[PDB]
Design a protein around this ligand. Structure first.
Ligand SMILES: N#CCC1C=CC(=Nc2nc(Nc3cc(C4CC4)[nH]n3)c3ccccc3n2)C=C1
Ligand SMILES: [Cl-]
Length: 301
């Protein structure tokens, strides 16, 4: 069925137990990305996580989410056939731009928030919002940002919270997760705050090479807007970051709310248009740091 319906070509990239190869639908020649999961040695419990991801991805159909077209089961191998995206990471793209302002960062965050809101409307919490999962659909200057990798996503029932587990990437983890408290949709809005922060200045709000002091920072909500770099950032941008980086997740801004924040919905009159070279230079260093993997910026095993 799989080799009758698709033809696998080169490897695009990988995961901690999955390869992604470009593929073409037979006989139409249409391209997709196939995520290939070797299932021969998987536990039932691990296969159930694959079942969850396939199920969640089949539900989600949105301009800013990489669409799953097909979930094929064969003997020892499962295939998740996704839309192909050729623009790479949003964050790598930003560093190659000649001109980058708050209005650009707003444009990005707006798309990210539309995808998060669609997830949340459909009872899905992503739990690992991070630059790695934010890909441009194509290399076009106009390309949509698309949300990827639902390998850690959970299905919530309405606005009921639960102890879904300690899962995610340290630098982007929310206080309630770290606290071993019940959680839900708000954890994705904390993660967006962190991403927005890094989108404006190019370094993370919570940073310490000692994982323990990293978590104490997060739980205390101890981030600031230091000079000179934040001095040129609009009050409205900081206000949004503040509303997302609220320790009490009940009082944290929702995705829908964040889409009506003036910095987002009134971008053209509220977001600063000044080039932020120093951000592009910092993002360069940030991205380079991320490439090295290790403790803070890498999804927890
Ligand atoms: N899911 C998941 C994780 C994942 C793993 C590898 C990955 N790399 C990657 N992915 C892609 N493209 C891609 C990935 C997907 C689908 C989101 C898995 N659709 N398109 C390309 C395309 C061209 C050059 C290089 C590429 N690299 C992107 C995402
Ligand atoms: Cl479809």
């Amino acid at each position: 069925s799989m080799t009758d319906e698709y033809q696998l070509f080169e490897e695009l990239g990988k995961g901690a137990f999955s390869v992604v190869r470009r593929c073409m639908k037979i006989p139409t020649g249409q391209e997709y990305a196939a995520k290939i999961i070797n299932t021969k040695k998987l536990s039932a419990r691990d296969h159930q996580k694959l079942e969850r991801e396939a199920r969640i991805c089949r539900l989600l159909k949105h301009p800013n989410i990489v669409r799953l077209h097909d979930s094929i089961s064969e003997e020892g191998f499962h295939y998740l056939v996704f839309d192909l995206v050729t623009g790479g990471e949003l964050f790598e793209d930003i560093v190659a731009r000649e001109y980058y302002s708050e209005a650009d960062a707003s444009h990005c965050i707006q798309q990210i928030l539309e995808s998060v809101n669609h997830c949340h409307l459909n009872g899905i919490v992503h739990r690992d919002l991070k630059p790695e999962n934010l890909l441009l659909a194509s290399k076009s200057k106009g390309a949509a940002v698309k949300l990827a990798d639902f390998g850690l996503a959970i299905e919530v029932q309405g606005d009921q919270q639960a102890w879904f587990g300690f899962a995610g990437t340290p630098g982007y983890l929310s206080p309630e997760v770290l606290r071993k408290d019940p959680y839900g949709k708000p954890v994705d809005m904390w993660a967006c705050g962190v991403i927005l922060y890094i989108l404006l200045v190019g370094y993370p709000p919570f940073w310490d090479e000692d994982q323990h002091r990293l978590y104490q920072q997060i739980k205390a909500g101890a981030y600031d807007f230091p000079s000179p770099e934040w001095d040129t950032v609009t009050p409205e941008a900081k206000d949004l970051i503040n509303k997302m980086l609220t320790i009490n997740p009940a009082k944290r801004i929702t995705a829908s709310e964040a889409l009506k924040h003036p910095w987002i919905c009134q971008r053209s009159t509220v977001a600063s248009m000044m080039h932020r070279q120093e951000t592009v230079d910092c993002l360069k260093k940030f991205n380079a740091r991320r490439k090295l993997k290790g403790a803070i910026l890498t999804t927890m095993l």
